[PDB]
Write a protein that binds this ligand. Structure first.
Ligand SMILES: C[C@@H](Oc1ccc2[nH]nc(-c3ccc(N4CC5(C4)CN(S(C)(=O)=O)C5)nc3)c2c1)c1c(Cl)cncc1Cl
Length: 281
């Protein structure tokens, strides 16, 4: 691989830790010593993406393309930023920001009341940050294609960061058994058309995910039945503990006509206003 001095990190400055997630492409917790040359004695907790034992040549290509995509897209608070890479004299390591509190689905579920505590403002605030993150990506012509709570990460300071933005079997399930088709917009699901507007649909589900504290969409619904519901124009019920205004927002996001869905630009402005008017108690 060519070196790119801007981003390169010597391997002796990277102490690998425990695995965060696998694939069979995998991710590992690590510590970078002097991630920026200006601050060389600092240790930073990072996540390192790398190949697994039986990766293809095209798997490598994909990881490289992901790295280059991130360089193109640039920095933003509400995305997982590239920090560095090891491309020389050893396997490819792609160093990204570490998110201590896991993905948003896990974060929400872990903070459900008994049967630490997220206020109404916290929930709305969560949606704002995710919208702000998607607006940036969208402004950089980046289409996520699987925007969901599982692909939003949460830092030590409760900052929402969008993941796997720089990357089909419909019946394949996620790590804990959810079907990604349930986040897909109709035009994407049927006509295989992906736009920013299709991400807005998916953001609609993400909203629903938030105000159900990591609820599972369409529980017990297989793929064939999902097609049925969408063709019938069915829409998920308003969650309990969720205003009409926010439900309207989801419904707007789930507008059958893509052009009639709001832009993330609009969703950022609306959520800005709502956060400030939502109480923290
Ligand atoms: C595939 C992996 O990809 C990445 C890519 C960059 C990252 N930066 N930071 C992470 C990360 C860091 C910590 C972390 N966890 C530690 C905990 C969740 C488990 N709890 S705990 C220790 O309190 O029980 C927090 N999960 C993910 C991370 C994961 C991933 C995972 Cl494991 C979970 N959800 C989404 C995705 Cl995309």
């Amino acid at each position: 691989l060519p070196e790119d001095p801007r981003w390169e990190l010597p391997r002796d400055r990277l102490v690998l830790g425990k695995p965060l997630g696998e694939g069979a492409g995998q991710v590992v917790l690590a510590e970078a010593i002097g991630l920026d040359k200006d601050k060389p004695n600092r240790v930073t907790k990072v996540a390192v993406k790398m190949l697994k034992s039986d990766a293809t040549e095209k798997d490598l290509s994909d990881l490289i393309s992901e790295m280059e995509m991130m360089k193109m897209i640039g920095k933003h608070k509400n995305i997982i930023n590239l920090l560095g890479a090891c491309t020389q004299d050893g396997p490819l390591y792609v160093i990204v920001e570490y998110a201590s509190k896991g993905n948003l689905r896990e974060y929400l579920q872990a903070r459900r009341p008994p049967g630490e505590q997220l206020s109404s403002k916290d929930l709305v605030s969560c949606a704002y940050q995710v919208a702000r993150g998607m607006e940036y990506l969208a402004s950089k012509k980046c289409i996520h294609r699987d925007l969901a709570a599982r692909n939003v990460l949460v830092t030590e300071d409760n900052v929402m960061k969008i993941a796997d933005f720089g990357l089909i079997d419909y019946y394949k399930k996620t790590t804990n058994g959810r079907l990604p088709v349930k986040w897909m917009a109709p035009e994407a699901l049927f006509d295989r058309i992906y736009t920013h507007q299709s991400d807005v649909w998916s953001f609609g589900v993400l909203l629903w995910e938030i105000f159900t504290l990591g609820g599972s969409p369409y529980p017990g619904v297989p793929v064939e039945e999902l097609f049925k519901l969408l063709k019938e124009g069915h829409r998920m019920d308003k969650p309990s503990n969720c205003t009409n205004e926010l439900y309207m927002m989801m419904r707007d996001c789930w507008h059958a006509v893509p052009s009639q869905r709001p832009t993330f630009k609009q969703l950022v402005e609306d959520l800005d206003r709502i956060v400030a008017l939502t109480s923290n108690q």
